[PDB]
């Protein structure tokens, strides 16, 4: 029920002349938008990515992002000139903005910035501020950025008003894709280990909440290890479970919302 909307921006500055900015947008774990450096326009990656916004509303929202990217590129380049020779290229900025939707028609917004892979700056309330751990020289860039009242007013409007209003639109428009149920397929295998290591591969399930356990009849095997959730291309999830002998008797059981109650047990 709690969806987190994310605008992820990644910008690379190789030298004084070379630069690149690419963005991607996620509603939960489904990609909604993409904005390559090559493109002048933000792209839709779902039929419902525009949400409940009108065409005139979207264009107005896109225009300010277009102006933003150009301005962002120049502002960093000027800040490098301002900090030289204490900081120099190559430079990587990562930006993470959006809001988390909650029950009872409420939300909470965020804007987080990372420098050279480390979180340094957030937008909080009415101004930019540095987080604990950040180097002290950032006080000057932040001072200069906070001087820009218009940028501050816009970011406030985006985080407080525009983002939550937009996401509620997406949730209404993309209900079928967001509430989609995909059945997992399970297959078993073995590889030699430092006893043999039985592997239970589970693939093609949505949503992400899954339950995978090795079981000797009713007894749930304690030595079961869950791996990492790995993505598929067709927007489904992959996961493997391992148990560290005597294999005749135990089975990989999988619970999921898609199966409609009836779990699948797969015997060795």
């Amino acid at each position: 029920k709690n969806y987190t909307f994310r605008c992820l921006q990644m910008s690379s500055f190789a030298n004084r002349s070379w630069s690149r900015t690419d963005s991607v947008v996620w509603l939960g774990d489904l990609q909604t938008h993409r904005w390559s450096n090559d493109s002048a326009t933000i792209s839709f990656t779902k039929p419902w990515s525009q949400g409940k916004l009108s065409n005139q509303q979207w264009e107005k929202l896109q225009h300010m992002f277009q102006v933003y990217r150009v301005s962002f590129t120049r502002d960093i380049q000027e800040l490098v000139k301002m900090m030289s020779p204490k900081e120099d290229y190559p430079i990587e900025i990562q930006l993470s903005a959006g809001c988390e939707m909650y029950p009872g028609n409420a939300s909470e917004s965020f804007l987080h910035v990372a420098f050279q892979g480390k979180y340094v700056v957030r937008f909080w309330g009415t101004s930019w501020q540095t987080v604990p751990g950040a180097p002290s020289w950032l006080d000057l860039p932040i001072k200069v950025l906070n001087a820009d009242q218009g940028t501050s007013a816009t970011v406030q409007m985006l985080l407080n008003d525009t983002c939550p209003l937009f996401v509620r639109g997406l949730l209404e428009a993309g209900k079928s894709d967001l509430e989609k149920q995909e059945k997992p397929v399970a297959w078993l295998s073995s590889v030699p280990s430092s006893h043999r290591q039985l592997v239970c591969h589970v693939s093609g399930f949505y949503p992400k909440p899954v339950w995978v356990m090795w079981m000797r009849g009713d007894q749930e095997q304690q030595g079961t290890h869950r791996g990492d959730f790995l993505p598929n291309a067709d927007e489904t999830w992959y996961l493997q479970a391992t148990l560290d002998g005597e294999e005749a008797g135990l089975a990989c059981r999988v619970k999921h919302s898609s199966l409609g109650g009836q779990d699948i047990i797969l015997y060795w």
């Epitope: 950025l145 820009d148 218009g150």
Partner: T-cell receptor, first 111, second 113 residues
Framework: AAVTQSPRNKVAVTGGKVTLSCNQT?????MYWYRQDTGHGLRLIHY???????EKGDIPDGYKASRPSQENFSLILELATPSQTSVYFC??????????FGPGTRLLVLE | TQVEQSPQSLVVRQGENCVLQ??????????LRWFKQDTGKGLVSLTV?????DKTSNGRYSATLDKDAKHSTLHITATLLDDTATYIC?????????????FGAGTQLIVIP
């Protein structure tokens, strides 16, 4: 919030060194050198984000810039040419957008 | 250029009003400033407009700004001899020190007493 310039008015010859100075006691980090010519807006030559650093403006050729301290920003014409006969304005500012302009300096380069 | 002023020059009689235009293509356009410059003199700030649809007043001077139209006007009410000067439109592309000012070539005003 005053910005001073010296000299106010200068006559120089082709090939000589010509140094135009600018001074502000406003503790402003940022200083900018412009030139004004008829039928043109003011055009940025050089600017400085702080002591011991200069950055190229839109029309930097022929000029070198020096920021010895917070207070002073200098425009240095090593080999002065007639094409540098102009009015030169200096300006300073803090983190805000306002640039505070000096009185202007009139340079004329004769053969 | 990115900042264009109109007319190039004009001559008015004492006590007549006049309107000076500014048109620009500057992106972004944070604020717009009108300067008065006497012959052989420096730059005196008359007003600075800031909003999307803005209007300002400074005695006999008043100015409008329309950011959608990227357009500004300077009205001088009941002109005097002292108004004989060049009037300069300037667009700043940021609301901070990171910005660059974009200057118009100016409009010459001559008032006949």
């Amino acid at each position: 919030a005053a910005v001073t310039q010296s000299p106010r008015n200068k006559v120089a010859v082709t090939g000589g060194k010509v140094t135009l100075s600018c001074n502000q006691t406003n503790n402003h980090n940022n200083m900018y050198w412009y030139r004004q010519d008829t039928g043109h807006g003011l055009r940025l030559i050089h600017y400085s984000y702080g002591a011991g650093s200069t950055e190229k403006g839109d029309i930097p050729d022929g000029y070198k810039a020096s920021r010895p301290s917070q207070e002073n920003f200098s425009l240095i014409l090593e080999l002065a040419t007639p094409s540098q006969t102009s009015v030169y304005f200096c300006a300073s500012g803090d983190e805000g957008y306002t640039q505070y302009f000096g009185p202007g300096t009139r340079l004329l380069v004769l053969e | 250029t990115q900042v264009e002023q109109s007319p190039q020059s004009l001559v008015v009689r004492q006590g007549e009003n006049c309107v000076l235009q500014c048109n620009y293509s500057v992106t972004p356009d944070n604020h717009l400033r009108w300067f008065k410059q006497d012959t052989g003199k420096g730059l005196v700030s008359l007003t600075v407009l800031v909003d999307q649809k803005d209007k300002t007043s400074n005695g006999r001077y008043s100015a409008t700004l329309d950011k959608d139209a990227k357009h500004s006007t300077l009205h001088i009410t009941a002109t005097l001899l002292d108004d004989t000067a060049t009037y300069i439109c300037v667009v700043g592309d940021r609301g901070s020190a990171l910005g660059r000012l974009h200057f118009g070539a100016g409009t010459q005003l001559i008032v006949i007493p």
